[PDB]
Design a protein around this ligand. Sequence first.
Ligand SMILES: Nc1ncnc2c1ncn2[C@@H]1O[C@H](COP(=O)(O)OP(=O)(O)OC[C@H]2O[C@H](O)[C@H](O)[C@@H]2O)[C@@H](O)[C@H]1O
Length: 439
Amino acid sequence: DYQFPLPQKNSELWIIQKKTLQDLSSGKQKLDSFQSLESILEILRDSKNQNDEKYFNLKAVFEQLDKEEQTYFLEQFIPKICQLVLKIKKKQLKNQIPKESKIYEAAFSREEISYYVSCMFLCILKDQDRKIYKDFRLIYLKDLVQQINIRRQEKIKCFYEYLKQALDFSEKESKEVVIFQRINCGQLEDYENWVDKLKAIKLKNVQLTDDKLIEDFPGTLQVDFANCDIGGGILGNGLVQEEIRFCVCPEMLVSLLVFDQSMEANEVIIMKGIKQYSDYQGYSNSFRFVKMGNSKIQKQKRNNPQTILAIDALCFNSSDNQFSEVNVSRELNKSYMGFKQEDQLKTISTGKWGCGAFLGVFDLKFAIQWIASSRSNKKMIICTFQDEQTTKQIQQVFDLYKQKNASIFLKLVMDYPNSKYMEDYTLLEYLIELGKEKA
Ligand SMILES: Nc1ncnc2c1ncn2[C@@H]1O[C@H](COP(=O)(O)OP(=O)(O)OC[C@H]2O[C@H](O)[C@H](O)[C@@H]2O)[C@@H](O)[C@H]1O
């Protein structure tokens, strides 16, 4: 059972940090330049030596601010997040692996979350014995590759926006509860077990969207396409589906502090109470922070909490047989164990799960997710991410197989690779051909 150390755990270093934090917070010490801020960060990191690449990306963000916000940043924001850190009472955070069919729940007030993200912003979250850090130090550091520095800068913009919002929390918002759950879902079911269980299951409703994203569907169980280490590359270079979600919803960062151990095959993570603080455009290299406006939709994203399911798909290489009984049952288990959580959210918002960085074939991952949402007795919204061809194929498959037997469907899918259709047809195209023939 691991306890992630907070700054007070190191009693000696804390004595040093606390005084600096107090000086800044009280105005006793006032930052007159970004260079004075670097000196502060160095003290807080217990560093005696630095170069001018150590804070390069933070400086780049600072230098994009106008004169007035630059002054605000040095004279108000930094002092104010120092004061947030000074409100922390805990000395460590428990990282517990739940027993079979049990849950480890870690609950926080919305303001407490902002204390920890402030710690990340000031680079003071580290386990020195393990030589592990859970803060923004790498994001601040200059990389050789320009595109990587831009990614890191845009992350900083999102986190900065979130912290400015947190500093303005009303009493009511500050006290709201955010919940992280690591859920052990019990015994995995093997392929033949699945084949048998599905005999009683009919395929349920699917809605397709080609132009909206998962986070555009409030009041659903929204899927995070997770790494088995929750958060993936958020504290480094990563900027695909999971990392972008953490960027626009930085409260999710606290999951890093309580779920150190990789998710097992029969575990899933649930996050509740999560709000969205930034908007964005682009993806990966083209990702850019966008300040949220005051449209009804944007206000709702900022003000209405959502519940997120984090499930890690298999990370495939190009020669892996994704249609193996072993690999299909793995994904059926993972998706079903996740989808069946929070049974009051009768609709799943998902998409190309495991089919980007993890190299999954979406035809198959759609089928697996459909079987899983169907067995959970839930509806599914599938985001195709501007893939018109796939949208049309899935629509036709849905129309042909809706309400049909899920076990029969599963077996049909599993026969694809060795069928006479494999060379000239994709899985979806195969299903369409077969389904039409049945007619
Ligand atoms: N907000 C979104 N909403 C709906 N669909 C989306 C969204 N963002 C991306 N997609 C689509 O989903 C696909 C899969 O996204 P990935 O992030 O590549 O998911 P995955 O293949 O499961 O890779 C998981 C890995 O990447 C992350 O670093 C994560 O931490 C893990 O290590 C993308 O290629 C894209 O088509």
